[PDB]
Design a protein around this nucleic acid. Structure first.
Lengths: 55, 628, 71, 70
RNA sequence: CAAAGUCUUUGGGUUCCGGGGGGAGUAUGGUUGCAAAGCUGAAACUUAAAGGAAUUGACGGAAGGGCACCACCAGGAGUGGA
RNA sequence: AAAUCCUUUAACGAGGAUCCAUUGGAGGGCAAGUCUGGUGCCAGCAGCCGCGGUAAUUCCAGCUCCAAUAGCGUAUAUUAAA
């Protein structure tokens, strides 16, 4: 029994992409991922705010 | 179950499949095939196709031409093969789509420094959507550069073409021996059997003569001399030419082949008793003078304005599902007269033989579509009718064409002629599943006047767009949704699936711009479309499971008219209305959950909808296409 | 007159309709025993053949349920 | 139906609304699912996740990066 | 559990035999038997659990007690009738 | 052989909308969102457990983030885990 076909695809409000700048790609991403973790670290009492600590 | 007997079974299966393949290869091109026909499409502007065709031309040539176009016959007994080349310009959408639906191998010529061009891109998306018979790519300027830029140019071509043509090699043309290699290639190639063409019988038009009945009539005997490439064309059947409608013919005859593989007599007549005839529609037509009733009961730029209002309505019907602002002066039960609510849209019944218009008296409804189609295709396949076979160089004397057809052929436009299967000229209700190309971003509303190519036809029409579900009730869409696949529906001649569904729209002065593309679903009027209307509200008094809502009606007895129809709620709640209270639009409503203050109470109303009657057959002549 | 109406079916399109006592002796008991022998034998011939029949019937029905799984 | 032996097969189409991409009688590169012939957790008696529809994949059609010849 | 021990600190000899649960001890074949059946013995497919010990006691349609005229008895007034 | 590529070198060739880096994922295994909008046991996701019956950590999109990184998925055979 073929009920429906594609109901959730085209019926979202089709939000297009915003504008950003590029990532550093290659080695400089590793320089960033090192400095973002182990250089300007904040001393943390329980380490509960993860890398995507989003409320 | 052994080493030998199972290898023997492999031998039997190889014999069966090789016999099938050598059955289907010899009967296409050669001493039985009509010719093998190749159409030629360049894409860019830098291609000088006279230089291409004069490299390509040589064997023995037999040079026809037309008023503008120049097709010709090519014959070589060295390969024992007939080619028939025919050149085309991209952008000439009428000519290319009319003779690549009857072409048999498409040769794309390409510039070396890039892939497609935009006019060629347009024609390429059209030819993708109506079915490629066989593509074979080619380039022309590769010998003019030494090895460095030559190799890198081929790599840039295979990168710029493998985002559209994913796997093919680029057979270059510089020398006439490259033309020999190309012809050896196009002789042996797996023909994609296009399923539409083989289920009918179609002639090309190699030569056209005309004899009028009277010259002031502008009607007369047409004389199409050409080969037959489909089934056995029967003579009692009808005939259609793709540009100028459908019309019944008088005389078939077989003159000799003007151009063999190596160097007035008729076989059949009309008789009109068995010959099916042109019935396009159903051929049957003491109270006081003072006091009230109360105490007596105690007794240029307007087009851009239209465009921007369409973008406004696509915002207001695509941010929102089908929200409708309410009327205010007219009694809101009258303007929504023929609306009734369903409890559930999937389940609750709706009689398909209930409210049929005066134009549903003028259609032919199939009772069982699938078995009638099986019976017709079964008579096509395993039978033999009395008409001429494939390959026969025949002329048709067609009784009833006009003269401008002949003049358009003398311009250089190609004529085709395919017969109809039984019940293919009568009008009924056609259902096309269809999606939208991301080439055009123009809004396409419901009853926009569009142009269809539903299976070798060409006609203006006015559809209604729908959800594509395999249920009973299907929703009306109010705009062409840019990413779903929808179902358009039109009064139109009936055509047996499969068939490709092209749609394009007049931009300005014959600039047919492609919008929609798809295939042909089940054709029957029984598929009724349901148009929905959402009436909005606001819950300005909120109690436990009971709420007073305004701004949905404005009378009082409107609520007495829309009483059994259940409400619903964007937060999911499924209640239905109790008594009204106000003389203005106000009502109390029971519910199941508690009602948020951030709510929008809204009900749904439905009717049956059906397309308009426009089957104007003539299509205006397209112009060369250009970039926006 | 509120949520219902007439709307009858009128005017459609052109539908192209497709026991052992004391005093018995030899051959008197033995006729009764031999009758019980033929009863038991023909009865269990029946029972064996019908068990084989329902084996065939269960097998073909489970083949049909396999077909309905696949098709 | 397959070509290479004549076996008939039920196969699955992965993403949403992608049954609209496929019409009857079209060359489909049927690919299997991952548990070596067992069914998926939700779907009874269905073995095979179809990838390609007429020499393009569903992951391009679902992202619209190509167009479908026929 | 005095062996169901000397077993990751894994080797005294040696036979049969189990690899999720169903489909199934079914097919089909061979074999024995007068026969019923016995012995040997699949696969297609299907399913994410089936199971083994112990562990709490919502539920008792399980049993005992104990209380109450927002329970009964003996009764009163009644309401429910207009 | 004769070339092309590689190497050596003259001349042009770098401001970030460029000379632009993708493939998968973000409930657990398993690394990383109870962020924002839609859809509402439908469409769908998911290798298994499970999700979705209107406040959806899994759907569909954006943004952020994760693993690898000029490579990464998926199917199948096979080996280790066994």
């Amino acid at each position: 029994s073929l009920a429906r076909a594609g109901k959730v695809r085209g019926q979202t409000p089709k939000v297009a992409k915003q504008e950003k700048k590029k990532k550093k790609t290659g080695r400089a991403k590793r320089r960033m991922q090192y400095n973002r973790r182990f250089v300007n670290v904040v001393p943390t009492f329980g380490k509960k705010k993860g890398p995507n600590a989003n409320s | 179950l052994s080493r030998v007997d199972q290898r023997h079974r492999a031998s039997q299966l190889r014999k069966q499949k090789k016999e099938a393949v050598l059955a289907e290869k010899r009967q296409l091109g050669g001493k039985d095939g009509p010719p093998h026909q190749v159409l030629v499409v360049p894409l860019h502007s830098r291609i000088s196709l006279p230089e291409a065709m004069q490299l390509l031309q040589d064997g023995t040539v037999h040079l026809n031409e037309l008023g503008n176009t120049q097709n010709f016959m090519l014959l070589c007994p060295r390969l024992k093969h007939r080619w028939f080349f025919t050149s085309a310009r991209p952008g000439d959408l009428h000519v290319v789509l009319d003779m690549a639906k009857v072409a048999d191998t498409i040769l794309f010529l390409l510039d070396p420094l890039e892939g497609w061009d935009s006019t060629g891109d347009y024609c390429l998306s059209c030819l993708f959507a109506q079915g490629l018979p066989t593509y074979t790519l080619a380039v022309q300027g590769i010998s003019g550069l030494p090895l460095k830029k030559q190799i890198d140019t081929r790599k840039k071509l295979s990168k710029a073409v493998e985002k559209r043509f994913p796997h093919d090699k680029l057979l270059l043309l510089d020398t006439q021996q490259e033309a020999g290699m190309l012809l050896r290639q196009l002789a042996n190639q797996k023909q994609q059997h296009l399923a539409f063409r083989d289920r009918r019988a179609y002639l090309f038009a190699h030569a056209v003569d005309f004899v009028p009945s009277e010259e002031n009539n502008l009607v007369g005997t047409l004389k199409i001399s050409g080969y037959v490439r489909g089934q056995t064309l029967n003579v009692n059947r009808l005939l259609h030419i793709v540009g100028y409608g459908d019309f019944q013919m008088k005389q078939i005859d077989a003159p000799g082949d003007p151009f063999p593989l190596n160097p007035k007599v008729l076989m059949k007549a009309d008789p009109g008793r068995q010959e099916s005839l042109q019935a396009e529609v159903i051929p049957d037509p003491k109270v006081p003078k003072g006091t009230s009733s109360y105490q007596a009961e105690w007794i240029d730029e307007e087009a851009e304005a239209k465009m921007l209002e369409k973008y406004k309505q696509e915002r207001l019907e695509e941010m929102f599902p089908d929200e409708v602002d309410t009327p205010r002066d007219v009694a809101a039960r009258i303007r929504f007269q023929k609306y009734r609510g369903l409890k559930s849209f999937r389940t609750s019944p709706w009689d398909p033989k209930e409210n049929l218009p005066q134009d549903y008296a003028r259609i032919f409804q199939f009772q069982n579509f699938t078995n009638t189609r099986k019976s017709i295709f079964k008579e096509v396949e395993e039978k033999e009718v009395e008409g001429a076979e494939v390959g026969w160089y025949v002329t048709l004397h067609v009784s009833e064409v006009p003269v401008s057809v002949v003049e358009c052929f003398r311009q250089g436009t190609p004529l085709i002629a395919f017969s109809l299967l039984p019940h293919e000229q009568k009008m009924s209700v056609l259902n096309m599943v269809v999606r939208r190309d991301p080439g055009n971003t123009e809004p396409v509303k419901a009853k926009e006047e569009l142009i269809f190519h539903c299976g070798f036809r060409r006609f203006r029409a006015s559809p209604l767009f729908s959800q594509h579900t395999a249920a009973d009730k299907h929703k009306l869409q109010r705009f062409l949704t840019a990413d779903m696949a929808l179902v358009a529906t039109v009064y139109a001649p009936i055509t047996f699936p499969p068939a490709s569904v092209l749609l394009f729209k007049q931009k300005s002065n014959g600039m047919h711009s492609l919008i929609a593309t798809g295939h042909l679903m089940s054709v029957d009027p029984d598929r009724m479309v349901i148009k929905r209307v959402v009436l909005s509200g606001h819950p300005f008094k909120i109690f436990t499971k009971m709420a007073v809502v305004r701004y949905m009606f404005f009378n009082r007895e409107d609520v007495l008219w829309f009483k059994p129809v259940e409400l619903r709620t964007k937060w999911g709640r499924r209640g239905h209305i109790k008594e009204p209270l106000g003389t203005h639009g106000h009502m109390k409503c029971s519910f199941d959950g508690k009602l948020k203050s951030q709510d929008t109470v809204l009900m749904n109303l439905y009717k049956r909808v059906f397309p308009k009657w426009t089957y104007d057959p003539y299509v205006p002549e397209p112009v060369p296409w250009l970039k926006s | 007159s509120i949520c219902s109406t007439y709307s009858n079916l009128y005017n459609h399109p052109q539908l192209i309709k497709y026991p052992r006592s004391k005093n018995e002796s030899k051959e008197d008991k033995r006729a009764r025993k031999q009758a019980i022998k033929e009863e038991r034998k023909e009865r269990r011939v029946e029972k064996k053949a019908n068990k084989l029949a329902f084996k065939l019937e269960k097998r073909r029905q489970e083949k049909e349920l396999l077909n309905l799984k696949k098709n | 139906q397959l070509i290479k032996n004549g076996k008939k097969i039920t196969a699955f189409v992965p993403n949403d609304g992608c049954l609209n991409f496929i019409e009857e009688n079209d060359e489909v590169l049927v690919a299997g699912f991952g548990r070596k012939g067992h069914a998926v957790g939700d779907i009874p008696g269905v073995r095979f996740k179809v990838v390609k529809v007429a020499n393009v994949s569903l992951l391009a059609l679902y992202k619209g990066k190509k167009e479908r010849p026929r």
